[PDB]
Design a protein around this nucleic acid. Structure first.
Lengths: 393, 67, 203, 80, 77
RNA sequence: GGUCUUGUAGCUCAGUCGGUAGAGCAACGGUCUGAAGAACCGUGUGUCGGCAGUUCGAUUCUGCCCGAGACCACCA
RNA sequence: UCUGAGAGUUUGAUCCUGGCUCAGGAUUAACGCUGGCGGCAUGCCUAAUACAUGCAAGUCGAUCGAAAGUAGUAAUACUUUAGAGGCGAACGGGUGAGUAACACGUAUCCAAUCUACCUUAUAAUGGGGGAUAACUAGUUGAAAGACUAGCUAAUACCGCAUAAGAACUUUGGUUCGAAUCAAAGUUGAAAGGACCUGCAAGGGUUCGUUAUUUGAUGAGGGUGCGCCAUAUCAGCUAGUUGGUGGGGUAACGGCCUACCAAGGCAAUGACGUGUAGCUAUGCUGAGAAGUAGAAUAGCCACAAUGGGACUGAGACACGGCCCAUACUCCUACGGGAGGCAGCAGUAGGGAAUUUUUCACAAUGAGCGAAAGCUUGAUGGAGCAAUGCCGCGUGAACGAUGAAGGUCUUUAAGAUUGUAAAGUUCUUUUAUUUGGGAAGAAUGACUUUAGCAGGUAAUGGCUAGAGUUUGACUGUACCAUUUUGAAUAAGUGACGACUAACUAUGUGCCAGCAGUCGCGGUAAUACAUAGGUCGCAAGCGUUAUCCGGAUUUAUUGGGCGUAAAGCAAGCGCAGGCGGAUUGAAAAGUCUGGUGUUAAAGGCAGCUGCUUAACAGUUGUAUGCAUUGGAAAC
């Protein structure tokens, strides 16, 4: 019994996406640190944020950083997401299986297009009513410019269709809160209070067989492969044989342990973050991106057809047309799957801003549902996030 | 995996070997080519044998077509 | 298949006899040559001894719908005693349960008897049985399971069944018991015992 | 015992303490049918008295078995 | 590691102490008998040898062997 | 788990920094030993991975990615 | 009363000698299509490579002291024992690195040994002493740990007499170094608890507790014999073989020591390079035999590598101890911890292996006056078509032939094929409605009647009754009980060997091949389409062991020209060898006791629906062995 637990309050996933040196990791550490002083303990030090090579000497995360804690209202799980290119393959996975969108901005540097990309990320997964904090204001004094910066942030969010006026913006700084100043700890508490509202509850379903997208796998000495993902429809308890569909041929396996980031659970509600231990599986077939479910699940598909609402120029995307040889990338919240686009007849070229339902030719057979949220991306940015409407192969 | 460089013959549809790839072999001698007593197992690895071929469909490893 | 399905097909090429008269069913003049395309000239041009031994073994195999492994087991059982191989082999041949069920006139075909045995509607020693490969001896009960008497098949079988003297039963009472052992000429003499017995040097 | 799964058979022996079960045995002393209702216990009744006089440790079912066979009845008289 | 044998170790420490203390008595007594030849010292040797022979310390066969050879060498007188 | 490089004839390879399909095996018609092979003469065999932008068209400048080929998963 | 099949392959074609490949049978097998089930077995051979976590040997209050608690009104029934004492952990568990020999299997010897339990019987269980933990308090150490002073008694320890029978000397008797009754002198025993009759006393019963008496268990040495290949390994071995005095083992011994003598083995294969756990047995065959030493069992062996000893009678001890090693870790950087070849699980290797699954409910062990737990020994459930065995994917009828594929490509024709439609039919598995047996009628424990000796009981034999003892557990099996032909077949080959042929493409390309080899465009073999057959929830190819291979020839070959007579002779041992008489005892046959384990075969039964399989009964291969049988 590594950890016995039965949650008495609903589980909620919270995350953060920020550009380098905004205090994104600083705020990530500070929220849990200040909650380790009034509420339940979190044991979140600076050594439990980054572990990969070259990321400890830079202060930015390569993969998501996992913390979890209780609260008076909702049980939260904090996942830390990267913010820069050459690692977007991992920030997409980190920020695509969240249930909130926290934006970190500072009064020491003006808003840069990375904030616009953060609003873009909030736009793809469809997370309205975000919580924005003007964090890290412990730098050279500003008297009235901060209000203008806040106004610019408020009318900055309308470029993607998000409300700006009803956003609970509060002054504060997390670095001084981590330094040992209770005055800014109060500001972080106000940030938490603003977070308590406007964040959508994770999607919950109790009767679907199962579905979980792979993110990574972890090896445990004596136990085996610990899978990373999110039980987001249905449920899964110990002792149920499970099929594996997607990116690989179907494979029947047995679940042995149900982890919840080094915990032990009987049953986990849909939408929560946990882990599952597999029996006799191989990491060459169990790869980041595929699907595991219960017998009778969604059929695997290699080709299909989906509608599209391409993002406009104002909505962060590009403005130049695409030919019929178009082979962009697709993201089912987990992995970059490449695919060809075939364009409806009686039209040669379509640009972001105009849309016709396109047929996608995926590289590998990916288990996809009809209406699945899938993002079409290329060139290190997003041009749209559509939904599947028909299956041909 | 043992250190012994050996020749193999390539049955199946042409070739499915790509200049230091991974393969699995089977025994069997041939009169025509001296110095080789081995074959490749088509179907169970990067080599998969099927196109316009259904006789002797045990070697040349492939799936059964479905109506 | 375990059940060949068509029986007529095998009797075409092999000239196999299952019941009273199968070479000419009056079915529009069925050929004794091989079905398909090549029933033209390959009649007797390339015969060698091993061949006749082989289709004689095959014909012997397809009188009862018996697979090769269970016949090998039966030959092992035959070799488990002494005496003439022909008599013991034939005796263990009829002794199979479905064969007696068919020979009583309670089933017009061995396949129907085997199906009835498998489905559990046949009784031995006052207890239901479901194995169509039983070895039997004197004093073995067989009933009709009166729930299975309204069947359109068993009724006609009882009305016009085949009479066998080695096992005696009253047709209208539907209660039988194994009585004695058969005689060689009673069984179809077209089967040559030598070839089928001595092709099996396997076990 | 060396019977079969879900239908085993046990042969009884008054083996010494340190000796392993179902291994090498000092002697063969009949057997029993512990699965069906016939009480069939085929025994020799030719060396058990000698071994008991010479030293033998009875196990749990030995009491009932040799009370049924009446050997305990004659054991008290053999002691005298 | 088993929690059932450390007590045995602590026991046999004192057991070994006692065994050494009794064995050295035999050692000194046989020294005395070999130095000076008489009946009384060898009788004391025999007494101690039988006392430690009954105890599970030295095999009684060895005590018998040693007493037999001691009386054999005593037979000169 | 992200790192560097590659994708060019049927094969191996070349290689203007934005105006080059260059070499050798291979294929074709033959000379010819009786014929094969070899040689010799002929002359041709490449959207220079798969997409979107920078721009004057970018194979060759970038960006995602498809694959692959070596390296690294250190601190209980 | 057993008791065997051949075929092709060179040359123009033959008769040879002869070299190979194929038709089978088994397994610890991987690969493709596959996927129905049942019961039974099997499932690290590869890296004796390291392995997290939890279990895998624990037990006794009627052994003792004492401490925590429950509750009874403070005295105290009662639970835990945190500790000293009792046994076991030495057997069970696993794996074969090493071992070419007393390692293994037997015939056999101790005239040199051993053995607690368990059964035959005597004598005592009496009287004293001392400390001794845990505890309490204190020091030190980061923790692990070491200590420093008081505490109590223990079935722990040591004395005292107890002492016939025991251990060792003195005489009279005795067997091929042995067996006994005497007379003495030295000597050696300890422990109580519990239960009662009974004024306590006095007395019994029980668990024990000590030395002798038969016993068994297991261990240990010299044995006869048999035991892998290799003289393109010829000498080998000096505490090493012999003599003696001391020890040392339970004991004889260069086992060791001290002092003296040079031996021993080996051509009739030592020494040595290599492989390997030996055996019962798995499999090929008619057998002599070959082969693999699966698992399962008997025996030997080491616990990452070496050592070194100790408690117990027994280890050189798989989860005991002291240390050097290599590695993984803690460390406040002084010092410490560690061993999955125990079960599952993980990393690596390999094509290649079970679930971090469950219960002491059956046996076996550990304890006791017992419920009680330890029981990853075991018993099961899941996964694995790995290997067997056995049942489905329908049944009776139905056609001068339903289309459509194929072929003649005349089609006014042959096929597919009674395959289908149709009728009901019964659902083995599905489906669902009920009962849940079953190994467990074994098993303790509590009461009713006499028999062991005193009866006053406890106590040992019984008979009977009894509540209670189920993981498998809705099981296989039945209920005409719900629906339903339904919820379910491929596979290799088709020139010959070798039952199974026709068209199209392809043109020494693509390929097949176990052999003749097939392709220079009219391919019955390349690939498809149709048809066919062999087999079947298994199927063909590969990795293997034998058979056919009479191809190691004793059984059952040869040496003139096919491979083969040393160029001959003198010629030790070694194998043979004219005839008789008589004794013979090594073979040869009759005789049983010990075995030759059991299992495994061979036959007969018993049972799960028969079979698979399990059990039962006997069945034999080899040496002692005591009589005898008389030609070789």
């Amino acid at each position: 019994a590594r950890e016995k637990f039965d949650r008495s309050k609903p589980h909620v996933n919270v995350g953060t996406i920020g550009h380098i040196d905004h205090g994104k990791t600083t705020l990530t550490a500070a929220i849990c640190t200040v909650l380790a002083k009034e509420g339940k303990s979190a044991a979140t030090r600076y050594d439990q944020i980054d572990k990969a090579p070259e990321e400890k000497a830079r202060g930015i995360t390569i993969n998501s950083a996992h913390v979890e804690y209780s609260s008076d209202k909702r049980h939260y799980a904090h996942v830390d997401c990267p913010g820069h290119a050459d690692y977007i393959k991992n920030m997409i996975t980190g920020a695509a299986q969240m249930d909130g969108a926290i934006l970190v901005v500072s009064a020491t540097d003006s808003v840069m297009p990375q904030t616009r990309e953060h609003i873009l990320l909030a736009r793809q997964v469809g997370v309205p009513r975000m919580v924005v904090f003007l964090n890290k204001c412990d730098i050279a004094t500003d008297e009235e410019v901060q209000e203008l910066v806040a106004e610019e942030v408020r009318d900055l969010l309308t470029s993607y269709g998000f409300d700006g006026k009803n956003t609970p913006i509060i002054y504060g700084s997390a670095l001084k809160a981590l330094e040992g100043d209770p005055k800014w700890e109060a500001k972080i508490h106000d940030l938490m209070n603003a977070v308590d509202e406007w964040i959508p509850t994770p999607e919950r379903e109790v009767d679907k067989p199962f579905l979980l997208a792979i993110e990574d796998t972890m090896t445990i000495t004596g136990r085996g492969t610990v899978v990373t993902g999110r039980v987001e429809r249905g449920e899964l308890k110990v002792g149920q044989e499970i099929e594996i569909v997607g990116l690989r041929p179907i494979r029947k396996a047995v679940v042995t342990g149900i982890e919840m980031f080094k915990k032990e659970l009987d049953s986990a509600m849909a939408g929560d973050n946990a882990g599952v231990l597999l029996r006799g599986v191989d990491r060459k077939e169990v790869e980041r991106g595929q699907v595991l479910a219960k017998p009778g699940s969604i059929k695997p598909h290699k080709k299909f057809k989906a509608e599209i609402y391409a993002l406009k120029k104002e909505e962060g995307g590009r403005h130049t047309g695409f030919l019929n040889g178009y082979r962009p990338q697709f993201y089912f919240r987990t992995t970059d799957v490449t695919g060809s686009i075939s364009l409806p007849e009686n039209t040669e070229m379509v640009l972001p801003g105009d849309n016709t339902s396109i047929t996608v030719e995926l590289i590998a057979p990916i288990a996809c549902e009809k209406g699945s949220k899938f993002s079409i991306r290329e060139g290190g940015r997003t041009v749209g996030a559509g939904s599947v409407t028909e299956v041909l192969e | 995996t043992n250190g012994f460089e050996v020749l193999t013959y390539i049955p199946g549809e042409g070739h499915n070997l790509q200049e230091h790839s991974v393969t699995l072999l089977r025994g069997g001698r041939v009169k025509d080519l001296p110095g080789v007593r081995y074959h490749i197992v088509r179907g169970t690895l990067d080599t998969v044998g099927v196109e316009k071929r259904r006789q002797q469909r045990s070697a040349y490893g492939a799936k059964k077509p479905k109506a | 298949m375990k059940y060949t399905g068509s029986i007529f097909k095998r009797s075409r090429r092999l000239g196999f006899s299952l019941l009273e008269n199968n070479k000419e069913f009056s079915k529009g003049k069925k050929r004794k040559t091989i079905p398909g395309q090549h029933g033209n000239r390959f009649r007797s041009s390339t015969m060698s001894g091993y061949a006749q031994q082989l289709q004689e073994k095959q014909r012997m195999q397809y009188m009862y719908g018996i697979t090769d492994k269970q016949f090998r087991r039966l030959f092992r059982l035959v070799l488990k005693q002494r005496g003439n191989l022909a008599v013991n082999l034939f005796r263990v041949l009829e002794s199979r349960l479905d064969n007696i069920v068919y020979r009583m006139g309670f089933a017009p075909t061995r396949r129907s008897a085997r199906q009835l045995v498998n489905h559990g509607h046949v009784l031995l020693n006052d207890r239901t049985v479901d194995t169509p490969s039983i070895i039997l001896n004197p004093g073995d009960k067989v009933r009709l399971k009166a729930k299975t008497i309204k069947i359109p098949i068993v009724k006609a079988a009882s009305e016009s069944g085949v009479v066998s003297p080695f096992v005696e039963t009253n047709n209208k009472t539907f209660e039988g018991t194994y009585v004695r052992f058969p005689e060689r000429s009673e069984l179809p003499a077209g089967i040559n015992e030598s070839y089928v017995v001595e092709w099996y040097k396997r076990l | 015992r060396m019977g079969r799964v879900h239908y085993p058979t046990y042969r009884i022996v008054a083996v010494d303490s340190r000796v392993k079960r179902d291994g090498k045995y000092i002697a063969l002393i009949g057997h029993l049918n512990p699965a069906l209702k016939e009480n069939k216990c085929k025994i020799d009744e030719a060396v058990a008295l000698e071994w008991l006089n010479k030293g033998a440790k009875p196990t749990d079912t030995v009491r009932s078995l040799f009370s049924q066979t009446g050997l305990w009845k004659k054991f008290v008289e053999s002691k005298k | 590691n088993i929690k059932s044998n450390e007590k045995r170790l602590r026991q046999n420490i004192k057991r070994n102490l006692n065994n050494k203390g009794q064995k050295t008595k035999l050692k000194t007594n046989v020294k005395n008998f070999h130095k000076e030849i008489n009946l009384d010292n060898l009788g004391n040797v025999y007494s101690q040898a039988d006392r430690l022979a009954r105890k599970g310390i030295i095999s009684t066969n060895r005590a018998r062997r040693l007493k037999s050879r001691n009386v054999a060498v005593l037979n000169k007188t």
